[PDB]
Design a binder for this molecule. Sequence first.
Ligand SMILES: N#CC[C@H](C1CCCC1)n1cc(-c2ncnc3[nH]ccc23)cn1
Length: 289
Amino acid sequence: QFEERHLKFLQQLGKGNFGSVEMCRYDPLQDNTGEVVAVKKLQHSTEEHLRDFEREIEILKSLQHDNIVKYKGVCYSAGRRNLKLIMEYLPYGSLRDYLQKHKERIDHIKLLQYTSQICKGMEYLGTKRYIHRDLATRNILVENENRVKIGDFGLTKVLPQDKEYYKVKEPGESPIFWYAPESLTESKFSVASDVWSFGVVLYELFTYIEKSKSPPAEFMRMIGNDKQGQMIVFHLIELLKNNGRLPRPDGCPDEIYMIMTECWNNNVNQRPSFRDLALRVDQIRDNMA
Ligand SMILES: N#CC[C@H](C1CCCC1)n1cc(-c2ncnc3[nH]ccc23)cn1
């Protein structure tokens, strides 16, 4: 639907490093009335990355939910080379940056509003048997002060019809400090490992993204900052096997930390569902108000 010649570059919005997202104006009438949109492209367009990007595009196109960023279309030059994904532009950036910038004015009730929206978006993914695999506040976007959306799906996979997990190992750096133990040890991804990562998201929110309190900083402190390369993963695995966990964030109530620790269960089958997480968050939020 979109022609590359009418996309005017304005700035880069994010880089995630087989791809990037740009802010552009789509101005087909060339009179500066077109709308500002978000444009995702590959940073190094190998055939493998292009096949993955096509699947990512189909996944996002199949999703319609208030808390999932909106698909708008695709753009390609040449024949079908230079594939680009066109999405709605969300003006407040990632939740990670937004939260950090406004920490003094965002209270716990608001954090739980965001939490509940994230759980509803994730439950919807689950109804389609999609596994996000990269849940983190850097992959959540803020549309306005009352609404966030899951904002990136570059690692999302569809479960096989006959299995409840998807086994995949990418080359290179993986966000290991958000990974469930079974993703670290067996490369198994499932709704339940998304629930583990959601617990880490909840942790991030209640730390208000304070620098020294990030999951990597906390876990590296727990394993020893001396550790390097491949040993980091090994020690993380052992740390999690021994029920080492991220600490309760400053100011976080016990009942919210308990949601985190229940998501961080070593037993995959005992982690809560996204519907129950949303139910519990909404009950705490009602109580607080
Ligand atoms: N979410 C998320 C992270 C994602 C980066 C991670 C991988 C490529 C870019 N990203 C998307 C954006 C963005 N910003 C503003 N409006 C948008 N709409 C669709 C994506 C998007 C900024 N960074």
